[PDB]
Design a protein around this ligand. Structure first.
Ligand SMILES: [Ca+2]
Ligand SMILES: [Ca+2]
Ligand SMILES: [Ca+2]
Ligand SMILES: [Ca+2]
Ligand SMILES: [Mn+2]
Ligand SMILES: [Mn+2]
Ligand SMILES: [Mn+2]
Ligand SMILES: [Mn+2]
Lengths: 232, 232, 232, 232
């Protein structure tokens, strides 16, 4: 299958597949069952920001999610990503809706990769354009007239549709390690707007890192965040 | 055909196609016949650096080439690149050898694009890896065991071959304008090592900007720098 | 006196000192009497953005001012700033009110300087803190509880006071040229919020570059933008 | 006294003050007695590179030192620097010689600080100029005709002098935390050239972070790296 590293913002607790019993952020290493989680005071209708970082000396993947005027949620996991991921990857965003639903609106996304053997890649998208040729849009992901990326289906009136799955991948492969590297790092930031008519919105949004040829696995909708074919 | 904007470092004067009678740098707008040139005191066997910039408010494309301990050469051309190039492009490097020849060794290459509607793309390659998945290598272009990019053919003993043509394009398309942009800019830097057994090395090296689907035109070897199918 | 290069956003036309008869942006080289102006459709109560750039090869200082949903204003002036400014400078923002007045609220400010002999300096302030130790606040300039920089006096109810003058300078000197430079460039961005009770707000806001020891000249209030001791 | 966080490159083992019995790199938190060390295969006469990073979510300060063709040395220490350092700091480099000596030549230094409440500061010095107005040079630190920073005394023939102490601080204070920060990070890189006539060169080189008003403590020469007044 694919090889996935993800930071999930998991709005829907699926205790049946190992979620804790609250919305949470999680570090996912080759499984939906997060290796580390933290409770997330999800706020619908408010714009949130997520920052993710890692460097290969610290071997600590971390993420922080916050909204204006609120406490941040943090999560960290000790991991050498070179033992998990291939040396060339694609970076992406994923989101899913299920029976319950939510918008998974990305307003901005930026990413920096460094590889000192200092090789680097940086992109920053604040306005997504109507046909973004440096993104590979998969499933239901589209950009809208407001210049936002809609990971999952929303109606023209701005209402989220159920059972949607969408991903956006930066077009260029990212070099995250190599045999002569002294140190590799990456940082990602996105802002996101989750709105929902539902008391329990579902399912979540991720930033992820995959084999470059990654595509939405069959059976990966809802709780699997468009990342994993099963909940192992 | 393709649409090309290039900064050439033209080592070989081909007065028959409008070159001035000396090595020169040039700004090429949809033609090998540079819209502006400056005389270049080409130094073989020394590492040189080229910096190219443009922003859409100034509407002035410029370049500077220097070596340590030497005078720099500068060239500028007033041009609104949105009247020349499509809004999505690829950026690349090209080089050619002819009957006379030279290495067209790139040691480092970096590029930054900005589009404020602040969207950006930045890459920097200081060590080119043995299979660079974020470059599209065309013609004879390869990376070598020293972690350099060889635009044109060199033997294992490091001797340049004649009648070579090679290009390297950054894999991701670059968004250089759009209908809602307030200002777009880009900057590129490369370092290069031209060595030659010849008293008149040929042919030259370029940084270029093209339609994303660009490929080496038929008939584009030698003086045409792997950019143009003819010398119109 | 000081040596000043500025981009003015001049809201108040003072035809008596050479202003054109409308709000305008201007490039000021050692004089309030702009070397180049463009008409500015000033919009009070809307957040605007200014981008300024220059590089030493192009020798073209330019600026663009825009608001969301509106046309941008651009201005350019051909100038070699090394013939104007010393090699070490400070960068700053200035603003003034007169009998008529306006807020000169800066919400964000960023600046990048490059000097390839690639030496660089970059700062970005999105939230100004209550005591910003990397700024030299002069005259009435203060930061407020919203994390904005108030160049000129505003009451706690948010009303602009008249006859105010304030400047904010980045604490560290900036190296903009030197004897061995091949190319020097800089870019600045700020966002600003000008609100006014007045049908003709006054006086304006600038980004400026000065001798490092610059201070508000005596007699520099109002139309002189806290930059110049007179209108020569 | 001062408050110091440092990454030391400690060439001289002073087992009497807690050094391990080999050259080593170390993370120093308010004491010369490193909280974490790693053995360093110091190579004199070869240019080395050090990268240091930290972010406040991971709470892990790390460093890596390498030379071309050699193994890197890494060291990490878990620490929340906001519990150690004040919110405003200066960043600097220090080096000392003793009875035994070494050059402490810095060829390049760069630093990036981020504070997302995304405020940032970045500098990069590849060529140090003859009078660097954005550095505060303390003790014997000077820049030389090659455009390098000599932290400790070297003769015009390039021979290191003994019992030297010098530091270079970036002129502007750096904001590393504040009450509303969601995440703060920093990265530093320097390259360095340690040459010595001695079989056991002394004493070492550091990157450090201090209260902004930091100055070379009395009694801080040699093993104390110009950082600490004693070896507690
Ligand atoms: Ca879930
Ligand atoms: Ca030619
Ligand atoms: Ca005026
Ligand atoms: Ca020691
Ligand atoms: Mn989960
Ligand atoms: Mn030519
Ligand atoms: Mn004016
Ligand atoms: Mn030690």
């Amino acid at each position: 299958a694919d090889t996935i590293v993800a930071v999930e913002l998991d709005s829907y607790p699926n205790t049946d597949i190992g979620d804790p019993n609250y919305p949470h952020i999680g570090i996912d290493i080759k499984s939906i069952r997060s290796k580390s989680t933290a409770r997330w005071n999800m706020q619908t209708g408010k714009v949130g920001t997520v920052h993710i970082s890692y460097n290969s000396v610290a071997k600590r993947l971390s993420a922080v999610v916050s909204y204006t005027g609120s406490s941040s949620t943090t999560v960290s996991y000790d991991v050498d990503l070179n033992n998990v991921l291939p040396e060339w990857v694609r970076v992406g965003l994923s989101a899913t809706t299920g029976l319950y639903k939510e918008t998974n609106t990305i307003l901005s996304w930026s990413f920096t990769s460094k590889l000192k053997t200092a090789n680097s890649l940086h992109f920053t998208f604040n306005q997504f354009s109507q046909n973004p040729k440096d993104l590979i849009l998969q499933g239901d992901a589209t950009t809208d007239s407001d210049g936002n990326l809609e990971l999952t289906k929303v109606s023209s009136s701005g209402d989220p549709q159920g059972n949607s799955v969408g991903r956006a991948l930066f077009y260029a492969p990212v070099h995250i390690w190599e045999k002569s590297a002294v140190v590799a790092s990456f940082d990602a930031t996105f802002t996101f707007l989750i709105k929902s008519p539902d008391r329990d919105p579902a399912d979540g949004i991720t930033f992820f890192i995959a084999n470059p040829d990654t595509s939405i696995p069959s059976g990966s909708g809802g709780r699997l965040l468009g990342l994993f074919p099963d909940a192992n």
